[PDB]
Design a protein around this nucleic acid. Structure first.
Length: 49
DNA sequence: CGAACCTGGTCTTGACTCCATTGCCGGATTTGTATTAGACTGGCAGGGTTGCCCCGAAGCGGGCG
């Protein structure tokens, strides 16, 4: 997700079957942690996915 | 055959002129330092976006003692 003058972010499936948020070129950081950082429950994730 | 002549360099005397060269000397300018008393109390900030290669370092899984 490329913005103009913002901050990059990526959701890359690794060598294993794990999706990972890389915000502003940080480390692997799986995406359910990012949804919980949006306050999304694990139940809300389960309902969504 | 001998005597003067005028004039080249070669040099000397002494007076005249003119300008460097300090030395003050007084003033102008300029370089550095100090001092401001109400209260103020943690920064903005884009280059990064390659490809490939070698290698050093962390980190964890794996067997292990």
């Amino acid at each position: 997700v490329i913005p103009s003058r913002g901050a990059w972010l990526e959701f890359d499936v690794d060598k294993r079957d794990t999706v990972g948020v890389r915000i502003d070129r940080k480390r692997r950081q799986p995406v359910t942690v990012l949804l919980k950082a949006l306050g999304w429950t694990s139940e809300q994730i389960v309902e969504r996915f």
